[PDB]
Write an enzyme that holds these catalytic residues in place. Structure first.
Site, PDB file in Angstrom:
ATOM      1  N   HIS A   1      63.341  65.139 -83.545  1.00  0.00           N
ATOM      2  CA  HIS A   1      61.985  64.591 -83.541  1.00  0.00           C
ATOM      3  C   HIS A   1      61.584  64.386 -84.996  1.00  0.00           C
ATOM      4  O   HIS A   1      61.265  65.361 -85.679  1.00  0.00           O
ATOM      5  CB  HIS A   1      61.006  65.540 -82.824  1.00  0.00           C
ATOM      6  CG  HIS A   1      59.674  64.923 -82.486  1.00  0.00           C
ATOM      7  ND1 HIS A   1      59.039  64.020 -83.338  1.00  0.00           N
ATOM      8  CD2 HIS A   1      58.892  65.111 -81.396  1.00  0.00           C
ATOM      9  CE1 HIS A   1      57.911  63.690 -82.735  1.00  0.00           C
ATOM     10  NE2 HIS A   1      57.771  64.327 -81.569  1.00  0.00           N
TER      11      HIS A   1
ATOM     12  N   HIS B   1      59.972  59.784 -78.921  1.00  0.00           N
ATOM     13  CA  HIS B   1      59.865  60.142 -80.326  1.00  0.00           C
ATOM     14  C   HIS B   1      60.840  59.418 -81.199  1.00  0.00           C
ATOM     15  O   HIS B   1      61.873  58.954 -80.733  1.00  0.00           O
ATOM     16  CB  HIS B   1      60.091  61.672 -80.481  1.00  0.00           C
ATOM     17  CG  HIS B   1      61.347  62.144 -79.803  1.00  0.00           C
ATOM     18  ND1 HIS B   1      62.546  62.207 -80.482  1.00  0.00           N
ATOM     19  CD2 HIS B   1      61.557  62.475 -78.505  1.00  0.00           C
ATOM     20  CE1 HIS B   1      63.441  62.606 -79.589  1.00  0.00           C
ATOM     21  NE2 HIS B   1      62.892  62.768 -78.385  1.00  0.00           N
TER      22      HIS B   1
ATOM     23  N   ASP C   1      70.082  60.834 -77.865  1.00  0.00           N
ATOM     24  CA  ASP C   1      69.211  61.615 -76.984  1.00  0.00           C
ATOM     25  C   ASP C   1      69.070  60.762 -75.733  1.00  0.00           C
ATOM     26  O   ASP C   1      68.424  59.720 -75.766  1.00  0.00           O
ATOM     27  CB  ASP C   1      67.851  61.881 -77.661  1.00  0.00           C
ATOM     28  CG  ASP C   1      66.972  62.886 -76.947  1.00  0.00           C
ATOM     29  OD1 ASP C   1      67.372  63.366 -75.842  1.00  0.00           O
ATOM     30  OD2 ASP C   1      65.880  63.175 -77.459  1.00  0.00           O
TER      31      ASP C   1
ATOM     32  N   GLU D   1      61.577  57.993 -73.631  1.00  0.00           N
ATOM     33  CA  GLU D   1      61.724  58.796 -72.425  1.00  0.00           C
ATOM     34  C   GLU D   1      60.440  58.845 -71.674  1.00  0.00           C
ATOM     35  O   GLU D   1      59.375  58.801 -72.284  1.00  0.00           O
ATOM     36  CB  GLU D   1      62.209  60.221 -72.740  1.00  0.00           C
ATOM     37  CG  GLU D   1      61.364  61.030 -73.709  1.00  0.00           C
ATOM     38  CD  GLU D   1      61.980  62.353 -74.093  1.00  0.00           C
ATOM     39  OE1 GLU D   1      61.997  62.658 -75.306  1.00  0.00           O
ATOM     40  OE2 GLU D   1      62.485  63.069 -73.194  1.00  0.00           O
TER      41      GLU D   1
ATOM     42  N   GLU E   1      65.863  58.680 -70.026  1.00  0.00           N
ATOM     43  CA  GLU E   1      65.716  58.568 -71.478  1.00  0.00           C
ATOM     44  C   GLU E   1      66.875  57.811 -72.096  1.00  0.00           C
ATOM     45  O   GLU E   1      68.016  58.034 -71.711  1.00  0.00           O
ATOM     46  CB  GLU E   1      65.662  59.985 -72.091  1.00  0.00           C
ATOM     47  CG  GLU E   1      65.586  60.060 -73.617  1.00  0.00           C
ATOM     48  CD  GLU E   1      65.494  61.477 -74.147  1.00  0.00           C
ATOM     49  OE1 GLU E   1      64.829  61.684 -75.189  1.00  0.00           O
ATOM     50  OE2 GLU E   1      66.034  62.395 -73.487  1.00  0.00           O
TER      51      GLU E   1
ATOM     52  N   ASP F   1      69.852  66.389 -69.478  1.00  0.00           N
ATOM     53  CA  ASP F   1      69.447  65.834 -70.762  1.00  0.00           C
ATOM     54  C   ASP F   1      70.335  66.463 -71.804  1.00  0.00           C
ATOM     55  O   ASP F   1      70.200  67.646 -72.077  1.00  0.00           O
ATOM     56  CB  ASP F   1      67.953  66.151 -71.026  1.00  0.00           C
ATOM     57  CG  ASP F   1      67.364  65.466 -72.254  1.00  0.00           C
ATOM     58  OD1 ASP F   1      68.146  64.901 -73.057  1.00  0.00           O
ATOM     59  OD2 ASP F   1      66.116  65.443 -72.386  1.00  0.00           O
TER      60      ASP F   1
HETATM   61  C1  LIG Z   1      59.676  69.083 -84.068  1.00  0.00           C
HETATM   62  O1  LIG Z   1      60.776  69.213 -83.152  1.00  0.00           O
HETATM   63  C2  LIG Z   1      60.564  68.911 -81.805  1.00  0.00           C
HETATM   64  C3  LIG Z   1      59.314  68.768 -81.200  1.00  0.00           C
HETATM   65  C4  LIG Z   1      59.243  68.494 -79.833  1.00  0.00           C
HETATM   66  C5  LIG Z   1      60.407  68.389 -79.074  1.00  0.00           C
HETATM   67  C6  LIG Z   1      61.662  68.545 -79.676  1.00  0.00           C
HETATM   68  C7  LIG Z   1      62.913  68.399 -78.872  1.00  0.00           C
HETATM   69  C8  LIG Z   1      63.363  67.297 -78.160  1.00  0.00           C
HETATM   70  C9  LIG Z   1      62.830  65.934 -77.979  1.00  0.00           C
HETATM   71  N1  LIG Z   1      61.821  65.586 -78.772  1.00  0.00           N
HETATM   72  O2  LIG Z   1      63.350  65.170 -77.150  1.00  0.00           O
HETATM   73  N2  LIG Z   1      64.576  67.619 -77.599  1.00  0.00           N
HETATM   74  C10 LIG Z   1      64.924  68.921 -77.917  1.00  0.00           C
HETATM   75  C11 LIG Z   1      66.057  69.663 -77.568  1.00  0.00           C
HETATM   76  C12 LIG Z   1      66.164  70.953 -78.001  1.00  0.00           C
HETATM   77  C13 LIG Z   1      65.155  71.507 -78.780  1.00  0.00           C
HETATM   78 CL1  LIG Z   1      65.344  73.130 -79.376  1.00  0.00          CL
HETATM   79  C14 LIG Z   1      64.050  70.790 -79.162  1.00  0.00           C
HETATM   80  C15 LIG Z   1      63.927  69.450 -78.716  1.00  0.00           C
HETATM   81  C16 LIG Z   1      61.732  68.797 -81.053  1.00  0.00           C
HETATM   82 MN   LIG Z   2      64.017  63.227 -76.433  1.00  0.00          MN
HETATM   83 MN   LIG Z   3      66.399  64.250 -74.302  1.00  0.00          MN
END
Ligand SMILES: COc1cccc(-c2c(C(N)=O)[nH]c3ccc(Cl)cc23)c1
Ligand SMILES: [Mn+2]
Ligand SMILES: [Mn+2]
Length: 366
Positions: free
Chosen positions: A230, A222, A153, A252, A347, A142
């Site tokens: 996100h 998201h 993403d 995803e 995803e 990923d």
């Molecule tokens: C509020 O921020 C969020 C909440 C939940 C997940 C993520 C997040 C995702 C994602 N939502 O796919 N991918 C990431 C890759 C690296 C990192 Cl440090 C975080 C994330 C961010």
């Molecule tokens: Mn994601």
């Molecule tokens: Mn991802």
């Protein structure tokens, strides 16, 4: 100018006029009332609103072409015997080259996830990690690219043993279902209900044991914002909020042979500045220096410890813990289902354009 093997030519050099290939364009799905949303494709008002944001879609497309070429390259050499560090560095070196890394204007949106087996997400090796990819491993690759904070993403699952084939097919089918159901004014919970129904229709047999594929219920798709992985809207992968015009989504799904719930496990590698935290004055010298390194190199984008090491930073763990304790930075530890379980992920990033739905990260692979 044509692409080399291994890829080394930046995407912007292959398309000098700055017009990048579109992803898969889809007509919006019909509403719950039965009436088609196809009118958007030919609406003069929608076409004008679409062309107004052409520069934005075009930044996602460049980032998506870098993503397709990087992942096709990874698939050609990823093998058991390689260390997780070797895999991540070889992938990221190619990603930096193809995106033409330029500070916060073009680069890596987040660390290379390569979560193994029961671990579904947010594992990347830290320095000293001797983990080696095994023949029986189920590895989730990923990784993210961006142009001006327009994030791709996009993720797939790597296996070498055919015993996981139907598990992979279930998750791929569930992700593609989620993508088909997505649309302007579609309720987020209706996308989740469709994902869940398809996922659970599959039964798999792995090492003499049978399981009904479960979607991971605390892992979700998201919305994506500029420099914001996100953006606040959640697409559940199980059974009020609607998707809106001009929004961008990461669709995803995660399928599991375990409990279908993840818990924080192992050591943390992933970190990201809280998007809503403003300027915080810090005097502690090591903590101040680390926050300045983060602001200059990552801003609100996610990073990992290996990315601090490559910038020549050392003795930062206490400084990093201070930023996490202050709520300036948030840790994102690996998310794992029960020991002995198997997890898979697919995803895509989709653009809810005024005229159509664009699966911008779609390739001939997945
Ligand atoms: C509020 O921020 C969020 C909440 C939940 C997940 C993520 C997040 C995702 C994602 N939502 O796919 N991918 C990431 C890759 C690296 C990192 Cl440090 C975080 C994330 C961010
Ligand atoms: Mn994601
Ligand atoms: Mn991802």
């Amino acid at each position: 100018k044509v692409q080399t093997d291994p890829p080394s030519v930046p995407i912007c050099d292959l398309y000098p006029n700055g017009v990048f290939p579109k992803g898969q364009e889809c007509e919006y799905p019909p509403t719950q009332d039965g009436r088609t949303a196809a009118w958007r494709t030919t609406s003069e008002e929608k076409k004008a609103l679409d062309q107004a944001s052409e520069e934005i879609w075009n930044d996602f497309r460049e980032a998506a072409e870098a993503h397709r070429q990087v992942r096709k390259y990874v698939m050609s050499w990823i093998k058991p015997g390689m260390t997780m560090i070797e895999i991540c560095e070889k992938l990221e070196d190619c990603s930096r080259k193809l995106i033409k890394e330029n500070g916060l204007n073009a680069g890596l949106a987040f660390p290379t996830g390569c979560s193994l087996n029961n671990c579904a997400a947010h594992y990347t090796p830290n320095a000293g990690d001797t983990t080696v990819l095994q023949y029986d491993d189920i590895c989730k690759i990923d990784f993210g690219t961006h142009i001006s904070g327009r994030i791709i993403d996009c993720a797939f699952t790597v296996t070498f043993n055919p015993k996981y084939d139907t598990l992979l097919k279930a998750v791929k089918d569930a992700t593609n279902t989620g993508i088909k159901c997505a649309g302007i004014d579609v309720r987020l919970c209706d996308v989740g209900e469709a994902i869940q129904e398809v996922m659970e229709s599959y039964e798999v047999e792995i090492d003499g044991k049978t399981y009904q594929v479960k979607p991971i219920r605390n892992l979700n798709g998201h919305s994506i914002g500029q420099y914001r992985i996100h953006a606040g809207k959640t697409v559940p992968i199980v059974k009020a909020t609607r998707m809106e015009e001009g929004e961008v989504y990461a669709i995803e799904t995660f399928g599991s042979t375990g409990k279908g719930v993840v818990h924080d496990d192992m050591e943390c590698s992933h970190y990201m500045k809280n998007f809503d935290v403003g300027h915080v004055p810090i005097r502690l010298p090591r903590t101040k220096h680390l926050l300045n390194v983060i602001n200059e190199n990552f801003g609100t984008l996610a990073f990992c410890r290996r990315w601090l090491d490559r910038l020549g930073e050392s003795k930062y763990l206490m400084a990093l813990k201070n930023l996490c304790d202050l709520g300036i930075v948030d840790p994102y530890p690996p998310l794992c289902d029960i020991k002995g379980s198997y997890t898979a992920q697919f995803e895509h990033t989709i653009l809810l354009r005024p005229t159509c739905k664009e699966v911008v990260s779609r390739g001939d692979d997945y």
